[model samples]
Target: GNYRLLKTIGKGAKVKLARHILTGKEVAVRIIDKTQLNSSSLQKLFREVRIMKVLNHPNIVKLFEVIETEKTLYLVMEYASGGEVFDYLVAHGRMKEKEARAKFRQIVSAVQYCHQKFIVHRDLKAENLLLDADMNIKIAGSPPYAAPELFQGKKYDGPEVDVWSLGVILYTLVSGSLPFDGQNLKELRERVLRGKYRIPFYMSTDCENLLKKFLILNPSKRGTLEQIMKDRWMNVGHEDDELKPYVEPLPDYKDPRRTELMVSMGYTREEIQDSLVGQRYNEVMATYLLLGY
Candidate 1:
């Protein structure tokens, strides 16, 4: 009663939208027909609900509550007003390297966090990646981005599959195109299984290199979420200054002896301070910076 039915923003077999009357907060409402659900479908629905409940991350869409009537099931979820990353790509054609890197960082962070929680999002693509009001990524993927193993119906590692999808997403972000596209499902499957995709010339060497690692045909050799996060390109210009103190504790670059050494090396105090901070307070890095290396 508290939620008002807003104009429909989406139309699938079982999804719609609404707004909370009291809070004025928009929410996605998935309407599943009870009569149409077989035992298998019902079980899957329950599993999905369970998985959504445990997912609590800034970059993951929030599931607020569930409501069921005699005829339907309603899943209330956080509304992502900014639409999908797919729409953004379509409108802009392609993003600048800096902008694409920023978005990719958020995506990888979210995926890594999900893997840490042992929940694998079986599907990942730009279309399913919604943007919140602040333009932050919110993963709401489906089966299109499913890994090759899924098509083969083999038991597989969830995170490994997710990594493959991330590679696809990254390619899309930078090139504004799918890496493995075909006229039909059979052709697409062949391309994916063979890992037959080319890196566009416009992508940086680092970007192209990372894509190669992630898009490996062998799942065992594919880049892990942990490895992706550590990648130089992914971490570039995306380091968190606050977390640096804990992860790589700032050294005593501020010490008088260190400062004197830097100054004696023909650098000013201002230069030393700048270098130290820029190098995340690593004394060795500060020295290198002062020495013009």
Candidate 2:
């Protein structure tokens, strides 16, 4: 009720850049008209909710709240004001090796975090790697980034596919284009399976070696997240501790001011605590978060 949906930002359906009335925070709201979504997309919707709930990382976009009606589903996410990485590439071409390495390091850590949670984000392409206002990289893709194993419409998956997509992402960051492309799906799938793509001339030998380890034809042959993290190429810019796991701050219930604020807005303290602790994802929980911005 406190959200003021503003301009249409982007996406599969309509995603609007909106202002939270109480907090004056800018949020990106994905308005999903569920009537139009097919079974697979709807499943992915549920998938995102589950995955986003478990994830807590600076590089990945944050899922603040989910508002559902029988007809519509609204997902409120952190607004990446800088723009999508795809748009960045299209506008600016490939980044310098230093800049790419910095951004790449952040992504690798986020993916590694997902792996630790036993969650595999099959979507790891450039189209959704959004950047925040400070030009910080934020992952926010599947097909062109999918593994050879994933291309056959096969089920049963995990982190190797994500690693494969990471390879594709790294390739894009350095080369300014997809590592593999074709006239159609058959050609693209076969090309992906065949395991053939050129290393960007600008890519260093160490970087080339790590990228090769990722795009290997078999899942077992692909480099593990540990190996990717341990790789010399991927660690160009910093100390080992720089990419350490992020520590989540205290939940809203622990904050006295927020509790009082919500209580002042006609909600009880118990309702806020119950909704939060229960992980209900209801308006009470969302209102607690909306004002948090």
Candidate 3:
């Protein structure tokens, strides 16, 4: 193994903080037990990997590599050191409009990027959010952020449902509380279906209007990603998101700038090109990804 294992950071797939031997960069590595997943379940995992492999936005959790062996699957990903937004909210209460506003841009850019790529995140919530070292957001997902259409068991447009979650996410971000939580699942479903939630008095009219647009019970009536991106609330402040979100098809392997550090680690440019060329998910590709951020 080219990575040095540190402490366990999570369970189930058991994510660990690992250090790349060559670059000395820390990454999150999930050691998955193949035997634990039945055939269909394993295939589902691979499908997730395929989707993840294609997403290269700055906000999403990036899967750097997958090492599959006879009985194990080693999944390496970007390490987000700042933990969940839910935890932050719990500790600090609501964010100032300025702080939440900046974060919303990053979240929306990444989410919008996913929508453009035809991927709709069915689950969205603060718990799914992780912060990078700079406190920039990295995304995961959660159930409370689901759409009303999902609760009704209706055939729903994937993007609409995603928009609904964004509404919930936006509400939570500024208010430091869920827009529609309930004592029971039934109550929660009913509340969501009814489009029932409170607006904090401090919430600006623009944000409130946008939030209402997101929480609309009519899936078609809800804001599309396009509408949501340009909503008055989103543009109220100048973009404070540290990384202007960028989406790119995978970068070429021979790009000198991206490959510079890896070349210094002694894996020649030729080796990386061969690995990256075929898009092989092997050790060379693994090292290639590890060297990147």
Candidate 4:
């Protein structure tokens, strides 16, 4: 049996939350219509799939399976209930230094791993950095975060461009805004090419220095993923200890008892099932849906 569609959680044409019929495990499904795939788009899709297939990192989104038919391609992936880091920024304006650092470290680690595998993400932005169940970073971005070199039609190192996007993400996380805001495409391109964006005064000296390194205009001078990993600020602490208390826990998805409890709370069996499915079987979230906790 096919996975049951829980709800449309993303772009209606592309992504949705689904559950395995037998296991009831939550998954994100990305559906691409073949009819709309021009050569360029199809090539990019193939490349993305190829890259994801070889990747195996905790901080990177996992691609579990792919199913293709005459008119569509379906990618089954690990569900990220915490959603995009961009959403987090929207809810809580700016993050505290420690919190942003924790998240940045994860991003750097994932980028480093991708570079080691000789895969360039080509896009890295807040919207791309999804948060998993435990609030860890998962890289999943698109072309809007494309590097300056990519726009110039010049050959560029993938890792360098990815680092540039990382700088943009860092700026947004700490300042609660984009460093390079422009009124139009021309203005935006000019700002990006200038490679000049202000670091908020509230950021620590080390953080400011790090952002500068990532935003360097010359790709040759851009910091490598390895170097960023070793930077003083990036190496500040054990991620497990520093991030444990801050990371929200994933709900108890494996506990079948949660379904029963929701039913007992006066929710109909169908209502409980719908809530659980919509919430990706997240018990706490289901409770909140039922009672607004």
Candidate 5:
């Protein structure tokens, strides 16, 4: 296909294009800006391309090939004309509960695959999520959905940070506002570190409860991808199904009262914790209980 760059579809540190060429097949190309090029940055871009090449999923953007020059790097990917999911939400307002659940599930599945491969997308948000003609969701990244953990001096684990970003995306979809909003980065980080989430009244009790649980600030406190996939909310449409908690064999407590307390605090499985550690006991317990355990 002969490539002709059309108008820019996205721009930032990385600029994106909707190129129309080669028998009318449209593709999205992300060009690494000339000013941002460096040995480290170039290496990272190549790594990202390698990561994308390794990941093959229906919901993910298809990476066609990479075009590299002495000064620039261009990544060619599948084109999705529907645009960013954020635009859809802005035009239509909040989505229907079922639709939100479905869209979020597809997004999480994509991220789950990434985590499985040890690729962490440090940024995830509505703006980064793209929809195909069929309304299927693909995972992407933007600033708002960047996890607080990235800002700290910590080593990266692809899944945990991505999961936290997913929680933010899920929260935004349901609440119609950022889960943590602040005038500046410091305040935003503080709110996120504190695990502050505002459950939307417009949503169903089940959804609010679920969002509250998912938005836990601590990466460790945030449940794993398996845990999220197995949540009851994700099983809304299945029939005659036996569903197990994603994280493992349910928490076994020889002490019945302790078990009840754990279950009451949202610890449905042995692998999960009843309360987030490091944070004070009362504060952690209160946070856990508020989400309906």
Candidate 6:
């Protein structure tokens, strides 16, 4: 017997919808578009299904049942309708620092769970992350927020890539902009390859430092997920209403040695002097640190 399709939820390689036969309980189904199902594609789809079968987590979408028909494949998962986290970010320019920290923390926790099972979301982006009614997140794929390590050509471990995506997501949440920019795909690819992007002056120091580490071109020195969770920027305790927002420390002009470092990074002596002019580095750092970063 076939369930009646009520309305389309989303469509991709597979289509999801509300099914009336199951008492109108929402179910996510994957129907392999007939156009995309050659032998190789079918094999790949099977592989993904098999992978999903073995993986399970509270924050990751759960697969309930898979059914095959003459024309399609169906994957039933718990219904989540809140929609993509990326869309949420788009609607809200930037999350409050505390709110961002809390959400990002949950994201890390989910990724950590995946890595533990030896499954890596080769594609992690905003579109792939779904949310429940409670605003809880469920991540899938290497979406736009995929880490730099995964983006590189060389084959690498999955967890490392997850770490990189976290960095990108972190940057996007705070800056309300992607760290990379290019006129087209060619330029975007080149920039991604070069790992070139600058922190806006208005961005917090902790954010810049965090991005600096995550967006590094070299994957070897890039921080790990463990390190990321340990970062000063991620601590949420400091987000109390009474405390000031997290601030990052800039090099002190009084210290000639530190001054040279900032200068070499393209800042001039005047820029260094001007950098923290209105910056409350100490206050921000204190807030984050007290939050237990």
TM-score of each model, in listed order: 0.76, 0.88, 0.91, 0.76, 0.71, 0.69
Better of 4 and 5 by lDDT: 4
Of 1 and 3, the candidate ahead on TM-score is 3
Model 4 residue 33 CA deviation (Å) reads: 1.9
| Model 2 error, position 112 (Å) | 2.1
Per-residue alpha-carbon lDDT of candidate 5 for residues 158-252, written as tens digits (9 for 90 to 100): 46777777777877776666778788878877777777677666778777666755666566778777777777676687545523322222323
Report RMSD for candidate 4: 9.4
Per-residue accuracy of model 6 over 141-230 as CA lDDT, tens digit each: 233454455445677664666666677787777777777666666666676777777676677787677777666666677666656666
Give lDDT tens digits, candidate 3, residues 135-165: 8989963557778778888886678888888
Error of 2 at 70 (Å): 1.8
Put down candidate 4 lDDT per residue, 1-293, tens digits, no spaces: 25788888878447889885434577788888978888898998888888876666778876665777888988777788888888898899899888998888888878777887778877676777899879898877344356788668779666788888888888888888887767677777788777777767788998888888788877888878777766766656664433221232354433456556655656566655654455432333324322321
Worst 10 residues of 1 by lDDT: 241-250
1 versus 2: better TM-score goes to: 2
Off by over 4 Å in 5: 4-7, 11-24, 32-36, 141-158, 240-293
CA lDDT of 239 in candidate 4? 41
- Residues 209-286 of candidate 2: C-alpha lDDT, one tens digit per residue: 878878888786787777777777766666555445445655646578788888888889888999889877677777
TM-score of 2: 0.88
Candidate 1 residue pairs that clash: none
Candidate 3 regions exceeding 4 Å error are 141-143, 239-246, 257-268
Q: How close is candidate 1 to the true structure, as a TM-score?
A: 0.76
Q: What's the true lDDT of residue 58 in model 1?
A: 64
RMSD of each: 16.0, 2.5, 2.7, 9.4, 18.1, 21.4
